[PDB]
Design a protein around this nucleic acid. Sequence first.
RNA 1: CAGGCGGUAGGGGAGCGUUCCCGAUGCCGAUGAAGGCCGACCCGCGAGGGCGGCUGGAGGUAAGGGAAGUGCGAAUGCCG
RNA 2: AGUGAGGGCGCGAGCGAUAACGUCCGCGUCCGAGCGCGGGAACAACCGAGACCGCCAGCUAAGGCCCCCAAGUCUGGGCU
RNA 3: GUACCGUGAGGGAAAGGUGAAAAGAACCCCGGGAGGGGAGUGAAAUAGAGCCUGAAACCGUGGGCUUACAAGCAGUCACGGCCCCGCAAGGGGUUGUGGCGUGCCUAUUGAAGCAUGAGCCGGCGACUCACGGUCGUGGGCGAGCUUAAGCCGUUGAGGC
Lengths: 112, 59, 150, 117, 140, 101
Amino acid sequence: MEAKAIARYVRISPRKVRLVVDLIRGKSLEEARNILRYTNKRGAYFVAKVLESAAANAVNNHDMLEDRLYVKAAYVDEGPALKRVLPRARGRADIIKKRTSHITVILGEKHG
Amino acid sequence: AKHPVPKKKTSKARRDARRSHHALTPPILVPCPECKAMKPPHTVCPECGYYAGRKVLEV
Amino acid sequence: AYSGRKIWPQKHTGRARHGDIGAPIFVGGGVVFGPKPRDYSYTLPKKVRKKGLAMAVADRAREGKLLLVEAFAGVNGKTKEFLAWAKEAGLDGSESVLLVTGNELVRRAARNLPWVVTLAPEGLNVYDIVRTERLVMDLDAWEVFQNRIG
Amino acid sequence: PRAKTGVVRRRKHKKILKLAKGYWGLRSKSFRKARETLFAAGNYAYAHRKRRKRDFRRLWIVRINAACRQHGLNYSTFIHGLKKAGIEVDRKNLADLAVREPQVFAELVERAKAAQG
Amino acid sequence: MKTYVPKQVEPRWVLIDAEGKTLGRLATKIATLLRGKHRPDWTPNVAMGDFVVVVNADKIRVTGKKLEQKIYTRYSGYPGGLKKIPLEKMLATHPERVLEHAVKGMLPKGPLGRRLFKRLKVYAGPDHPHQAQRPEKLEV
Amino acid sequence: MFAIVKTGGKQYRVEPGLKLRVEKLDAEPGATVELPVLLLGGEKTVVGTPVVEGASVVAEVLGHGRGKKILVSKFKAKVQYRRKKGHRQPYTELLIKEIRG
RNA sequence: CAGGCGGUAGGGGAGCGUUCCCGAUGCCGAUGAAGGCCGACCCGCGAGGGCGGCUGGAGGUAAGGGAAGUGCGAAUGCCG
RNA sequence: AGUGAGGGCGCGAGCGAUAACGUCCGCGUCCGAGCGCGGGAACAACCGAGACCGCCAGCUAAGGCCCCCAAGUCUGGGCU
RNA sequence: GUACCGUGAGGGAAAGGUGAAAAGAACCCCGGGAGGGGAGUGAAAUAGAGCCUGAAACCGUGGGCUUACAAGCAGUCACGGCCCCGCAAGGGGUUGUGGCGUGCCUAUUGAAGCAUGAGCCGGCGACUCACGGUCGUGGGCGAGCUUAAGCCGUUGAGGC
Ligand SMILES: [Mg+2]
Ligand SMILES: [Mg+2]
Ligand SMILES: [Mg+2]
Ligand SMILES: [Mg+2]
Ligand SMILES: [Mg+2]
Ligand SMILES: [Mg+2]
Ligand SMILES: [Mg+2]
Ligand SMILES: [Mg+2]
Ligand SMILES: [Mg+2]
Ligand SMILES: [Mg+2]
Ligand SMILES: [Mg+2]
Ligand SMILES: [Mg+2]
Ligand SMILES: [Mg+2]
Ligand SMILES: [Mg+2]
Ligand SMILES: [Mg+2]
Ligand SMILES: [Mg+2]
Ligand SMILES: [Mg+2]
Ligand SMILES: [Mg+2]
Ligand SMILES: [Mg+2]
Ligand SMILES: [Mg+2]
Ligand SMILES: [Mg+2]
Ligand SMILES: [Mg+2]
Ligand SMILES: [Mg+2]
Ligand SMILES: [Mg+2]
Ligand SMILES: [Mg+2]
Ligand SMILES: [Mg+2]
Ligand SMILES: [Mg+2]
Ligand SMILES: [Mg+2]
Ligand SMILES: [Mg+2]
Ligand SMILES: [Mg+2]
Ligand SMILES: [Mg+2]
Ligand SMILES: [Mg+2]
Ligand SMILES: [Mg+2]
Ligand SMILES: [Mg+2]
Ligand SMILES: [Mg+2]
Ligand SMILES: [Mg+2]
Ligand SMILES: [Mg+2]
Ligand SMILES: [Mg+2]
Ligand SMILES: [Mg+2]
Ligand SMILES: [Mg+2]
Ligand SMILES: [Mg+2]
Ligand SMILES: [Mg+2]
Ligand SMILES: [Mg+2]
Ligand SMILES: [Mg+2]
Ligand SMILES: [Mg+2]
Ligand SMILES: [Mg+2]
Ligand SMILES: [Mg+2]
Ligand SMILES: [Mg+2]
Ligand SMILES: [Mg+2]
Ligand SMILES: [Mg+2]
Ligand SMILES: [Mg+2]
Ligand SMILES: [Mg+2]
Ligand SMILES: [Mg+2]
Ligand SMILES: [Mg+2]
Ligand SMILES: [Mg+2]
Ligand SMILES: [Mg+2]
Ligand SMILES: [Mg+2]
Ligand SMILES: [Mg+2]
Ligand SMILES: [Mg+2]
Ligand SMILES: [Mg+2]
Ligand SMILES: [Mg+2]
Ligand SMILES: [Zn+2]
């Protein structure tokens, strides 16, 4: 038994967020709260808000107890990127890929 | 120069392989004495504003 | 419905060579040996067609499924009328039936029936014949039949 | 009537990716790579089905020569004793007895020993 | 039916004295005991051979004028790095190396082959550092 | 206590009540056949020249049946030559019943 | 029963699968159509075909024939 | 139908330099198409040998039988 | 004939599908919003509007086998270990060591070739048709065979 929350379409490159998530995967809910409170990365913001929304779900929706929670599993799926255009030299354009991510976090209880 | 160019697509392995030290490392945390809450060492605590006993920055 | 232009020069493009986009190699290109209209018909020889018509018919009497009739009793342009005339001639419609008569009023009636194919005599032919078992027929039609042969 | 390609190809490629399961990298994911890889396997096997035969043949002969060398004599004479003596136990079941039934082998050594002269 | 597979074997430790035996011709059969081909169940995919300890290595023989004229060659990796030291010099200074360098060449190359070399234990002169192993002296 | 028999043009070491498979035979799935002995031994130690005269082996042809098909390919390069034969090997499966030597 | 059976250019042969028509006012089909994903089972020398579980939600089409926009890995191919 | 670029080797000639993995004919072979198999360290055409499928069965061929490597540290006489 | 491209003549796209019915998700929870979790509608919500089915390349997370003295067209053959399905026999996954092993295509006397083409996946893509020849073949009639255009009839009916 567990509760999850998912930030779909967050406009940041998945490769960059996975680095973040990997910090917390498995940790206690309050280790996370601090791990992200001081991690030096954009994605910490977007990871945190999932974590915080996920936990809020787990208690306020699924019986659970905040001090019992830990990240059972997390993972950043990649989502549709915005293709845009970058004028290069000599008339060539290039296709820049502003990417996005689906950030999933899943916590659970652990009775000790 | 004559425009060096990679000659073979990187294997997925050799890609994933190079990244082997890209793994981020977590922040160094001490607990702030004056509040028992977590802060990065040798820095003035963001929460209580005390540092080395005295109260440095008011929060 | 495109244009003629050679989309990009013959050389130094570094792209593969082409001409117009209409070329069937492209998507939206023309079709290579795509169907045009045709006339599938021919003149299957008059002797053969005659010879077929015979054998078809003969094959029914060989099974004994041909049935000549002259009398169309109640039959008078209502289905029920024929539906009972059929009753009284081993035609409950277990087998499917080719009906061949001169008069309209009968084929009129038998028309809407889901095991009957009707037909003017002069249009009696071998696909509609082979298509069914029992083949029922006017005496006035049988006249034309043996006369459309010979 | 246009016979749109349809399911044929995707199905046909699929039956290959099947056969290519367990292959390294694209050789297990790319049709064009299975076919290549698979071409090889198909020849490699038939080559080795034909070869596997003369593999054991040698493994036996080693296990045999290793046994006559225990009873003084060598393989190349040990046989000619069997060939003279009229015995026709195969090299398979020779090396069989060699491990499993030493004393039986030793008896066989003796007939062939004798039979040479 | 299927061929017998060797379940698992306790190793066999030999004692061979090199003193007054031709180099190669000794190496030739040390190989086969290393390789373990001598045992009537032998199997080429696993390391069952005989742990051979060799003695009086430095006191080995060789024919011809080979003492002087047969030269060992090895190459560093740098230019002119071909080092070439004669046989004389070798057993003069690193004695045991001679017999080894000759056996390694008669052992199969790659994994198991190299593994087999590590079972061969060679000492120049009088005796060896593991009487504790209880090594059977073979006279071949 | 075994025997070295011959069948299918291959020699097999068999003991009583043995499950084994031989090269296909023409006998009944349920009947029996006598296999020749080339060498008997166990408590005895008989040697054939090439076959031991008196020694014979009973075998219940327990069931015929077909093997497991193997795709055997063939490929010649730069010539467009490829060939797929699927082949399953026929086999009769005997139960070794008893020895007579 | 005996014998032949390597094969490029290439000649011949026998089949498989796709699209459609007759078979069809029929037949299968929400007790689940087409397609998708699995399979160590079945049949076939093979191309294939069955079967079974999962998905899927509305179509599908026999035996036997017929007609073709009929089978792709390459074309610095075309599109995505 | 395809083919109308042949190649190497043996041998018989010319040309060449009694040169060339040279060239040009004649006879034959082999490769081509047998870059399938064994030898030849490896290696189209040298030696052996013409692969329908299967076998943990057997005789051989060239070549081999100290060890890597299957099988003689075989046997007798002689030379270096 | 739009976006867009060209001064211009002109060129010239891509882009369809929730469900029977909007019943298109009130209200609570985290959130700046996005978006998610409950609840709710539905026969079904991995039918939630970035909506039917939802393959592949490609990217993740968990699991099992596996790997840091081995060298390599990545396979194959054998053995062995650990893992899973089987009472058994058996299988399926993996691969440590051993045997053996010069990619596909085209073009070529000859290619692994340091010749050629291909990043990968999917989809599109190349021997047709009309007339007339000429063999072959299945039929019809046979010193004869056959109709063309058309006319009559049918609405997939033929006859003349
Ligand atoms: Mg910070
Ligand atoms: Mg409670
Ligand atoms: Mg708290
Ligand atoms: Mg710039
Ligand atoms: Mg890019
Ligand atoms: Mg790019
Ligand atoms: Mg605090
Ligand atoms: Mg236009
Ligand atoms: Mg006429
Ligand atoms: Mg007449
Ligand atoms: Mg023999
Ligand atoms: Mg033994
Ligand atoms: Mg001497
Ligand atoms: Mg001197
Ligand atoms: Mg001592
Ligand atoms: Mg001492
Ligand atoms: Mg000591
Ligand atoms: Mg008897
Ligand atoms: Mg219809
Ligand atoms: Mg219908
Ligand atoms: Mg229902
Ligand atoms: Mg279902
Ligand atoms: Mg289906
Ligand atoms: Mg079918
Ligand atoms: Mg069926
Ligand atoms: Mg089913
Ligand atoms: Mg059909
Ligand atoms: Mg493109
Ligand atoms: Mg010419
Ligand atoms: Mg050619
Ligand atoms: Mg070749
Ligand atoms: Mg080669
Ligand atoms: Mg060869
Ligand atoms: Mg050859
Ligand atoms: Mg020896
Ligand atoms: Mg003399
Ligand atoms: Mg709030
Ligand atoms: Mg808010
Ligand atoms: Mg919601
Ligand atoms: Mg409900
Ligand atoms: Mg559902
Ligand atoms: Mg359902
Ligand atoms: Mg959705
Ligand atoms: Mg949309
Ligand atoms: Mg989509
Ligand atoms: Mg999707
Ligand atoms: Mg999916
Ligand atoms: Mg290690
Ligand atoms: Mg390796
Ligand atoms: Mg290696
Ligand atoms: Mg389990
Ligand atoms: Mg089971
Ligand atoms: Mg088991
Ligand atoms: Mg297994
Ligand atoms: Mg492996
Ligand atoms: Mg295994
Ligand atoms: Mg290997
Ligand atoms: Mg005539
Ligand atoms: Mg006439
Ligand atoms: Mg006309
Ligand atoms: Mg009508
Ligand atoms: Zn504080």
